[PDB]
Design a protein around this ligand. Structure first.
Ligand SMILES: Oc1ccc2ccccc2c1O
Ligand SMILES: Oc1ccc2ccccc2c1O
Ligand SMILES: Oc1ccc2ccccc2c1O
Ligand SMILES: Oc1ccc2ccccc2c1O
Ligand SMILES: Oc1ccc2ccccc2c1O
Ligand SMILES: Oc1ccc2ccccc2c1O
Ligand SMILES: [Fe+2]
Ligand SMILES: [Fe+2]
Ligand SMILES: [Fe+2]
Ligand SMILES: [Fe+2]
Ligand SMILES: [Fe+2]
Ligand SMILES: [Fe+2]
Ligand SMILES: [Mg+2]
Ligand SMILES: [Mg+2]
Ligand SMILES: [Mg+2]
Ligand SMILES: [Mg+2]
Ligand SMILES: [Mg+2]
Ligand SMILES: [Mg+2]
Lengths: 293, 293, 293, 293, 293, 293
């Protein structure tokens, strides 16, 4: 029994209108508004949603939702967490329905990040993805889940223990002149969660979303430049996942990492002291002032 | 040890002559009459038969025959069922020979549906399938077994427990505005058995048979229309298996679901609130008045 | 730990000169004479040999040599046989060297057939196979071992227990109007050993050797016809392995089954009541007077 | 938990300048000098290095570095070695940093060869391999590690026990008229370590490095001939790995075996009494005066 | 008979030392100096050279060398040019040897650009490409020739007539708000020559060289940024060839266009009014101040 | 209409017994003796023969036999040769039958080498190739014909004109420090005929035969070394065809070039000044004292 993907994430925001325009125009995500007073959804694929956007918010992560294959794996992982001393709560039907899942449990990772484990997402096969702007392609999701994030941790060894229990694999992959960053995978995506020991004002450092087409990544980069949105780290290729990516500001102040061409996760641990090219610092103050080239 | 396919099914009918004409002309199945006073066979492939048609009957399912790989799996599953508290009977040679199998056991699922577990079907490699009408292609069988059915259940959780013990995987896949339907697989066929909590006059709701060719599905649909046979649900594509199918009346009053292009089963649970298109209700009273589009 | 192929076989013969001419001209095997007074070898591939031909003999099987992957599997299987009550003898270096293997043990199957289990065959990569007559192709060996045989058994259930312990899988595959024949596999070859309950004057009923090319099978058949050698069963295709084969007399009186186009073994048990075509009886008295078509 | 590749090796040399010229001109390896007073590095691929060359040395092997997938396998193998009675030392951060690995332990094989087990090599993805002379291709490394070696052993059975514990598989593959040589694999490379019982003045008999291109192997052979460097064994093809190789003197007196076209390791043990062609003795005194053709 | 590739080009430069450092460090080309007083060579592949760099020069193009398949095509094209009224000179052996070709003719295109047509380039298969800095990959050459250029033309219709006679195909592909640019191909490279009506101080506007690997393109871009070399047009993707490219200053003042992922030429004419993304103007004065996004 | 392969060759020899042993043991060719007093045949494949060996001979080439597709191409090429001023003779049935072809014409190339053009070779599909020694593989023939040769020419331009008329393509490919050698192809074999201006005592310089397997080439090389047969040029790889080959003496004094891994012919002319590696001179006096490395 193990987590198999980053299924969904919840964020809260102070400016929902800015977020709708940002998500659609700058990224190509689809806005779905179900008429709820306090939230809307962002789509990437056939799932009803991948991101829940809550308003009256704190401009930060609200929860990560990690999928397991089914009820037997849900029950086994729950018991594993209990046996290891972690505190979990199995949610009732109302709470599961709020997330639009068949089964749901809530806990917190060792860094304080609200963590949900679920099975049975709602897939709207009748409602194909329709991007918020014209796209050459689509997003890479499927068995790789929605993307990845770096989140704050206060104790890297304890974080690693928790994510290992959940079925993730990975360790320190960068020693940057020394800062150490750890990257963990639960499927073919090179990593789904990553972290280090750096102090951080927010739970969320960045969210990476992956395009199928280089043309969409480039156009997104151009949208950031034309609209004069801060780029924290310039275009570059990571040594671990081999993806072409950049990092730009969101209206909430944490970063989005649009990217293209991520490689398959490997179980064999290796480490690097820098990236392949690029990812030079441009705008500062976003929690990623590392020297990568 | 696990069930690996829906190997055969037995039905009983009040009008065997109507069933011969229906099976051959409307569906393209092959009638095999071995001169027995009380039954004949329907073929789909090289197996001696896939369906036994008993006459002097009740116009309903008589038994489902689930295959295991061999004697060791047969013996292991038998003991598993006994240990879990289910009542089984290991059949003698005469009874096994009646079904034309090397080993046979009989039991009943929690909904009262007679359930057989066997190994070693008779394959007539010398006698290739010869359809009851001209076909462009053939049927999809092989590792996927003969097809799938929905059968009546009175306790969904108990049904799920039983089929899980037998090696099936699956859960609720549709929440239709709320009706919940569960679908379970034991091989690459998207599902082989499915059920929900709806009251039903018959054990059998429908049997799905899959053509290799769209042209045969379309011609079958045309045969139903031309002969003015009730179509309960119109052409459409299911969100789970992605197959193009419709549902038509059989002479016994339960439905046949001829189809084409079923997708591979997945172990990762998801659910839907509707189909991709179609499957609108036409004729009523057949136990499937759900809103799928 | 399991047997992985029929590695070699030993036979003894009354007329070694006739056997050399037969093996080369009629079958295309390669004769290798190492100058030993009491034996010579037959080759099929890069192995030093696949068949040892002893002279001053009884015109029957002397031993079957079953390969395991290595020493750990050899030791594990030896202990398994001991624990189950079978009598084995681990051979010393001289005896292992006689067979040209790294490790050797000797036992007897429940029908009295001398049975050897070994690891580490001698492969003469420096000495490519050179057939005893011109061939269009070569033999099918590799992961499938040298071929298959039917051998005499006195207790089918005990035979099955023994071969199952050794890692073989399979059961009754033919019910011929009733005679039952069992076929067991230990690799991709449809079967490597088979048996039934019929009385037999010899340990060996037949040995099947498989050509890569239909042209070589046909030419071999023609050689039997032209030289007026008894054909016991005519050309035909088996329902289990789908191979085109015939059965002809050897100088020792047991049969050779030259063949072509054998299918991959399947773990799922099925049975047949006849072959696909052919295999009609021609010459009688060879222990295979079954009705296969 | 098992060793997955020969990750690195350390050697010590009396003439570092001769080694730089040899490695670059004769073999095409890349010299990397980090300004350390007592060592330099040789590269083959993206790894920071594959060979450490220590100076003020003994012209022999200093250590073999065997990789495991990650920390869990490192910890499991360490405990396995302890439980079996072997003496290991888990290294501190300074020592791990010396080797540029995330975790390191040191021990000695039963023949006295210093043996290191590590996880997390440093990969310089920013610094692609740049050969020390023009090459048509590159080296075969990746999942196959850097190459293979024969090292001295005093007790073959004890050596085999040790490498088996580490996850290697293999046994005697040559009986050369009798000398027995054992070859063990831990990945797809036909073998990564090999040994026999012959007396040897040095720990290291030879190191084999594999080119992707035959043209580079041939040019290397020509470089040895033109520069009048001793060739111990002439061009030939091995019966086990099917590679085209020759053996030439290094400035340290042990042999390099440049090669091309190695086959995939097999778990099924076989043995040979000679090679496919070539590998005739030319220069003597290098510890490989065997008759291979 | 037709031109099949841009085989070589000659340039002349005022600062050969700056060009050596630029070509090697910034681009990864290989410098080959044959000891000639007035020139050196740049390599990209197995050809003896692709670019001749003459010194005591004008910082501009000296000649384009267009390859034909062999002598029959050389002779046919020569006669075609003569028959159409163009002035050509068939070169003697000394002149052909200067270019290291088997046959050579010299002419001038309608814009005054010295144009050479040749067959039989010198290929140094013994001397594999060795880049002037470490590269992840190599260059795209082969059937696509060395790259492409834009050169000055004074009469677009006459230029088109000339290149059409030589076997090129293509027409106006961009109408940029109106400036019209024409692009012509002679092989699978999307184009090998292009031109428009804009006034130009130099014969050569830019030369495009294509990497096999995105990582090398990105590293080259980084080298331009780090060394503060003018980038005329920023990273972007062309609508015609779909390549990712940027344009940077050379020491001669004309531009290099390093790129990656060019698409196959198409014979069906289409046109665009802008690029896919990027190629925004940065540094001005380089003859490409067009609005492409 | 064009020649499509080197179909057969005739040689005459002073020592037929030495030639039988040489061809079989040293090369693996098959000797076929039809009981004719003055000749025997050598086979490589299903053709009745590829080489006719005449005795009472001159130890040189007697004729090259070039195949055309059929009668229409035979008639067209005959008329082409006549129209161009060459002297041909269309052979009668007896003469065609001597060569075992359906149609035959005889002429002489400009260097005096007897040249035959034919259609309709005799293929003995009933008699598969059986090599004169054990082989790992077979020969490369099929659409590539039997091999290639260098033959004497007195006027290279006239030779080129003749072979061009016959449908061959090619030109000078080596300028060896200056000696120029021309190589011409008529199918996918890199070349089938080659020549230069060097004086030669014999019509035939060498015949190249190509193995499918490197192992057979290496074993052949070893046979030459062990039997102390002159090797004129050592193992090496040609820059044009990329084949691994060496050149050894035949009993007739001209050379055989056994080889492996020839590349596909290219229509685009290029030239080289040396080989990739090897082909160093060993034994002299065989008409190939060129410097190739
Ligand atoms: O996705 C990533 C891969 C590698 C990284 C390496 C260092 C910082 C951030 C990184 C990141 O977001
Ligand atoms: O085969 C099926 C797939 C999905 C279904 C969904 C809802 C009702 C029946 C269904 C069915 O027969
Ligand atoms: O190889 C065989 C396959 C099937 C058989 C079925 C019945 C008798 C002999 C058989 C046999 O030798
Ligand atoms: O790599 C090798 C393969 C086989 C061998 C067989 C005998 C000696 C050395 C050998 C070797 O270095
Ligand atoms: O390679 C190119 C493709 C398209 C272009 C379109 C407009 C200007 C330059 C271009 C170029 O160099
Ligand atoms: O087959 C050949 C290819 C290239 C050659 C190049 C120079 C001499 C002989 C050659 C030859 O026999
Ligand atoms: Fe990231
Ligand atoms: Fe259904
Ligand atoms: Fe058989
Ligand atoms: Fe070796
Ligand atoms: Fe361009
Ligand atoms: Fe040649
Ligand atoms: Mg990772
Ligand atoms: Mg399902
Ligand atoms: Mg079987
Ligand atoms: Mg091995
Ligand atoms: Mg174009
Ligand atoms: Mg050529």
């Amino acid at each position: 029994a193990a987590v198999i993907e980053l299924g969904y994430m919840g964020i809260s925001v102070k400016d929902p209108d800015a977020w709708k325009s940002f998500a659609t125009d700058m990224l190509g995500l689809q806005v779905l508004d179900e008429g709820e007073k306090d939230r809307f959804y962002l789509r990437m694929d056939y799932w009803h949603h991948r991101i829940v956007v809550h308003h009256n918010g704190q401009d930060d992560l609200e929860y990560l939702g990690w999928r397991v294959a089914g009820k037997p794996e849900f029950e086994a992982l729950g018991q594993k967490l209990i046996d290891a001393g972690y505190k979990i709560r199995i949610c009732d039907k109302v709470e599961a329905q709020e997330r639009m899942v068949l089964g749901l449990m809530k806990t917190e990772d060792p860094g304080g990040n609200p963590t949900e484990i679920f099975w049975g997402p709602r897939i709207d096969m009748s409602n194909p993805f329709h991007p918020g702007r014209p796209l050459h392609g689509k997003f890479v999701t499927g068995d790789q889940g929605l993307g990845h994030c770096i989140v704050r941790q206060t104790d890297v060894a304890e974080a690693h223990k928790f994510y290992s229990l959940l079925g993730f694999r990975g360790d320190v992959e960068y020693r940057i002149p020394t800062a150490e960053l750890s990257f963990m995978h639960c499927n073919a995506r090179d990593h789904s969660i990553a972290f280090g020991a750096m102090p951080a004002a927010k739970r969320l450092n960045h969210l990476m979303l992956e395009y199928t087409h280089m043309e969409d990544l480039g156009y997104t980069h151009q949208q950031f430049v034309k609209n004069e949105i801060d780029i924290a780290l310039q275009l570059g290729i990571h040594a671990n996942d081999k993806a072409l990516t950049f990092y730009g500001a969101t209206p909430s102040g944490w970063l989005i990492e649009p990217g293209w061409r991520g490689a398959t996760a490997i179980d064999e641990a290796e480490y690097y002291v820098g990236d392949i090219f690029g990812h030079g610092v441009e705008a500062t103050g976003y929690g990623l002032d590392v020297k990568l080239s």
